Amino acid sequence: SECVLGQSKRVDFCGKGYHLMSFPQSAPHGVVFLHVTYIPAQEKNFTTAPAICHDGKAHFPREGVFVSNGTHWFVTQRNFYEPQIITTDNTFVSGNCDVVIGIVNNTVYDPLQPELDSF
Amino acid sequence: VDCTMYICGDSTECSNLLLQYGSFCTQLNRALTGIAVEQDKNTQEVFAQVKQIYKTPPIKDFGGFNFSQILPDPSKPSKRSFIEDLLFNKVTDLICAQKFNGLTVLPPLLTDEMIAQYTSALLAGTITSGWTFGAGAALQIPFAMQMAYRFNGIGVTQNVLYENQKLIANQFNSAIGKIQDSLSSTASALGKLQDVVNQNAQALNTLVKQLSSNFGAISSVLNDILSRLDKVEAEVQIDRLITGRLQSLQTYVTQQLIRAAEIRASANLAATKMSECVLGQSKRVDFCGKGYHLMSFPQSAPHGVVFLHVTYIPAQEKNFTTA
Amino acid sequence: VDCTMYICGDSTECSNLLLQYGSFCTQLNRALTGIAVEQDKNTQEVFAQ
Amino acid sequence: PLSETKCTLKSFTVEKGIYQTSNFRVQPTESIVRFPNITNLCPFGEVFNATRFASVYAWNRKRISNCVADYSVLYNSASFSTFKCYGVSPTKLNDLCFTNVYADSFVIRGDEVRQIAPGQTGKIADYNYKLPDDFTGCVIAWNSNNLDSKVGGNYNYLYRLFRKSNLKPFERDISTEIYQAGSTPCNGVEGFNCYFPLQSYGFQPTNGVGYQPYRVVVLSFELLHAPATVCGPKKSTNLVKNKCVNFNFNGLTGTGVLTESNKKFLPFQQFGRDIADTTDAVRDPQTLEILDITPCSFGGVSVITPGTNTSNQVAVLYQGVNCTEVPVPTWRVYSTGSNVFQTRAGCLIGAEHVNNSYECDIPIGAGICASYQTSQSIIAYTMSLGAENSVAYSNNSIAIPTNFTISVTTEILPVSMTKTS
Ligand SMILES: *[C@@H]1O[C@H](CO[C@@H]2O[C@@H](C)[C@@H](O)[C@@H](O)[C@@H]2O)[C@@H](O[C@@H]2O[C@H](CO)[C@@H](O)[C@H](O)[C@H]2NC(C)=O)[C@H](O)[C@H]1NC(C)=O
Ligand SMILES: *[C@@H]1O[C@H](CO)[C@@H](O[C@@H]2O[C@H](CO)[C@@H](O)[C@H](O)[C@H]2NC(C)=O)[C@H](O)[C@H]1NC(C)=O
Ligand SMILES: *[C@@H]1O[C@H](CO)[C@@H](O[C@@H]2O[C@H](CO)[C@@H](O)[C@H](O)[C@H]2NC(C)=O)[C@H](O)[C@H]1NC(C)=O
Ligand SMILES: *[C@@H]1O[C@H](CO)[C@@H](O[C@@H]2O[C@H](CO)[C@@H](O)[C@H](O)[C@H]2NC(C)=O)[C@H](O)[C@H]1NC(C)=O
Ligand SMILES: *[C@@H]1O[C@H](CO)[C@@H](O[C@@H]2O[C@H](CO)[C@@H](O)[C@H](O)[C@H]2NC(C)=O)[C@H](O)[C@H]1NC(C)=O
Ligand SMILES: *[C@@H]1O[C@H](CO)[C@@H](O[C@@H]2O[C@H](CO)[C@@H](O)[C@H](O)[C@H]2NC(C)=O)[C@H](O)[C@H]1NC(C)=O
Ligand SMILES: *[C@@H]1O[C@H](CO)[C@@H](O)[C@H](O)[C@H]1NC(C)=O
Ligand SMILES: *[C@@H]1O[C@H](CO)[C@@H](O)[C@H](O)[C@H]1NC(C)=O
Ligand SMILES: *[C@@H]1O[C@H](CO)[C@@H](O)[C@H](O)[C@H]1NC(C)=O
Ligand SMILES: *[C@@H]1O[C@H](CO)[C@@H](O)[C@H](O)[C@H]1NC(C)=O
Ligand SMILES: *[C@@H]1O[C@H](CO)[C@@H](O)[C@H](O)[C@H]1NC(C)=O
């Protein structure tokens, strides 16, 4: 029910790694489950921060995590390195920069501004 | 249990009569061996879930969270944590009498040092890499940042963690202190483990005491029957003892097989809690303690496991009109 | 089940012979008591949540 | 040991594993006997060869104590027509000790000898001499028509013909009050339904065997925790300690490693007991010292073997045994010290201890495992729990996977078993 008819969030219930799907096979007086799972590989180190301080606002990722390649800051999904520019759309604001321990200063792009500037 | 030594002791005269019952002694030894082998399987499936023996960093900068009561204490040869010592001292009976009557206790495959080393690796991987070591390679992440992921997993925005990080850290440290104080004070907390020790000690004491029963023979002392009666009359008396002693072993082995099933079910549950509460964050209600599950920490105990479940409990609710 | 009343009923003559079997009646009463106590545990863990 | 595995598995081929074949036991080196040092011979002659016996209603009893017996002289005499022992074998009786012995003697008809047994009923068993249901003595009887009968009839011997109720075991009743068989009182005189309770036997030498007089002697032996005042003629051996030996203290027979005991026995105590009621300590009947009776060591013999498809070499584990105890099962060629290793599971023999660590191949216990490895030999090692790893944690560093692997893994679960009736 949980591994073949659905996708299970239960850790190690449907094999090692994050469960994708399972296939049943019959065996004599038994069942064989082929569990298909996603295992992350080839990890790289990155500097990280809980929030980005911009214009006195504290920005947090909507989804994902902030990472730096050493010179620039990006936001990326937690399970696959796909870096994206930090913007007002992929981050949310909450409070000022004085409360978050470890907040780092960086710019946050606003896609509305260049349209008005160019128009 | 050496079925032949329990029933007949040193007597060859009795041993020859016991052969007339055939396979019963092999069946009893085989059943008890299967149980003993399953105890190693039960321990392996609960604790050997971690593939590598992870070590904590020397600089324990976990964002204000203090795991010292649950991390290993290097000052001891057992290398157990502070709470693991409390558990061992709190849980841990005619052993010599039992031994002399053909009964024997086999040591577990994994020593308490090895089990403490597994819980150490499980705990070290959890605080240094979150759930990533469960699914594959251990990916380091700052502890406060993985705690922010835990908050997202319970439907709380991650800014609530970072804005209240000092409060959350203080609440955690205080809550761990309450565990330390509680286990240091009360005797009844570890009843589940003590009950297993008591049931198995009582079963062995019952088995030894049955050797004193006559079962209708002129005496319970098998050596006296042989010293006092000739073969044709002795074999009649010995067969009464054999019958009652064999029935005593069958009763004991049958109840041990049933207890083994109870322990097996509990070990399967514990292995599931290790995977779903320690190696991950469980959305299953009340599976990993009351409240919304954040994370769990395993601690070794005598013949058992202790899970410290960390949960978020909402408080100080206010009424609001809604639409 | 009172192991002594089931096996011997009212007879003291039988009860004295039953003592030669030793602990068997205590074991049976103890096992049935453990089952009975577990039925309350089973109900409590389901409903008293 | 490999052949023993093959035998216990009932197979000519054995898969890799540890197999509990058989139990080791330290066998006794020698046999010790310790009876009391009493030289006084027991006076059985004066009960069997008495000139006149007692009337069965008033059966005589003589205590036999503080003496050494020789029951073989009695049993081998061949002078007795009946010699029946209850709960004790006639032949083994001379190899045993008793706390006290009581010799009962009386004369009865040949047809009445059958009543002198445990659980019997009838005029003699009910009203003259009753044996208990759990009697532990011997009953001896012989025809005495040469002594107890005379022409015209001998009336020297009486028996109780009437009684108000049956006698309890070993009870005696010497009362001569006239028995009232009816509702009318007897006023101390004989009459209708009023009869004197004792009747005299009529022993003529020409009477049939069932009516001839028989002399009966009943020897009652009692076995208790008390000291043995009566014992057989076996000579006591010297006493040895700290070695596995058979022993026989006042008849208490067993096997163990007799050792001087620190147990503070009170002056009246003779034995000590285990939970299984086996004797745990004993007082020597000659020196009065206290000795411990720990049993000679035993343990499971587990044979550690790679598959026979791989090699016929095996190691042997003596579970719980200390390596000093294993002698150099039926085979003993293994026990030489060339490869011997004291694991906490027991003495391990024929496996090579190594300081390296590997995954557990064959589990031995207490963290020890064994494997067949290189020049090949069975090695024994502490098992590795896994590869050690420092996660490289930092308060501002994160590792993110730049790729992934799709893994397919197989889980097998039993669902049913064969339906049997
Ligand atoms: C991640 O990096 C650490 C070491 O960090 C280095 O310094 C940082 C500031 C940053 O520049 C990192 O990218 C640098 O690599 C690695 O940890 C070491 O690993 C080696 C084995 O390769 C080991 O011998 C050291 O003891 C480790 N150091 C510590 C402090 O634990 C780690 O391997 C890197 N991880 C990945 C996936 O590349
Ligand atoms: C970090 O990422 C930035 C991307 O934003 C890299 O900067 C670019 O580098 C390329 C050359 O490889 C240039 O052609 C681009 O013009 C750069 N973009 C900007 C906005 O400067 C940077 O090289 C990366 N650094 C490291 C160490 O990986
Ligand atoms: C982020 O940038 C702000 C300025 O935009 C920094 O704030 C200043 O910090 C100095 C001390 O280092 C103070 O003397 C100034 O008064 C601060 N200015 C304001 C407007 O608050 C801040 O320190 C920077 N943070 C980091 C981590 O570099
Ligand atoms: C982490 O917690 C431990 C308690 O487990 C703290 O240790 C105590 O420290 C105080 C002094 O601050 C001592 O008086 C206690 O005796 C210590 N107890 C033990 C068991 O060591 C420790 O200070 C905490 N460390 C941090 C960094 O917060
Ligand atoms: C195995 O048996 C030997 C005795 O044959 C033990 O050796 C003794 O050990 C004690 C300390 O426990 C010493 O005081 C003695 O001097 C030792 N005697 C000899 C002759 O060496 C040995 O300790 C036992 N080992 C185990 C694991 O039981
Ligand atoms: C991600 O990993 C896969 C392997 O799992 C890489 O695919 C291989 O790439 C090499 C070239 O570097 C080829 O020669 C192999 O044939 C590829 N294997 C398969 C199955 O296609 C892939 O290149 C990696 N991607 C990144 C971005 O690192
Ligand atoms: C991390 O540790 C450094 C010291 O090495 C400290 O300066 C910094 O404030 C810490 N950052 C966080 C987020 O705790
Ligand atoms: C009775 O006397 C005879 C000798 O007249 C002797 O052989 C026999 O042993 C005696 N009986 C016993 C019981 O000693
Ligand atoms: C038996 O012999 C011992 C010497 O071996 C002696 O001390 C003891 O007094 C003797 N027994 C009695 C009852 O005197
Ligand atoms: C035994 O060895 C043969 C090769 O000679 C191989 O085919 C077989 O699978 C092996 N079996 C086992 C159980 O090792
Ligand atoms: C194993 O280590 C011990 C020290 O603990 C040493 O005496 C012994 O020689 C070592 N053996 C091997 C084979 O390295």
Numbering used by the authors:
A (entry chain A): 1030 to 1148
B (entry chain B): 736 to 827, 848 to 1078
C (entry chain C): 736 to 784
D (entry chain A): 295 to 622, 631 to 676, 689 to 735
Give the original sentences from the paper that presented this experimental model.
S glycoprotein trimers protrude out from the viral membrane and are the major proteins on the viral surface, making it the main target for vaccine design. Sequential cleavage of S at the S1/S2 site followed by the S2’ site within the S2 domain exposes the fusion peptide (FP), which mediates host-viral membrane fusion, allowing entry of the viral genome into the host cell. Overall, the S-trimer structures are similar to those previously determined for B.1 in situ, and are similar across all variants.
The most widespread lineage with D614G (lineage B.1) became the dominant genotype globally. The on-virus structure of the B.1 closed state is similar to the one we determined previously from BavPat1 B.1, (the B.1 strain analyzed here differs by an additional V1068I substitution). The significantly higher resolution of the structure we present here allows more reliable determination of side-chain orientations and allows more residues in the 630 loop and FPPR to be resolved. The structure generally agrees with that determined from recombinantly expressed and purified full-length B.1 S trimers. Of note, B.1 which appeared and became dominant early in the pandemic, and from which all variants tested here are descendants of, removed an interaction between K854 and D614, which may also favor these transitions.
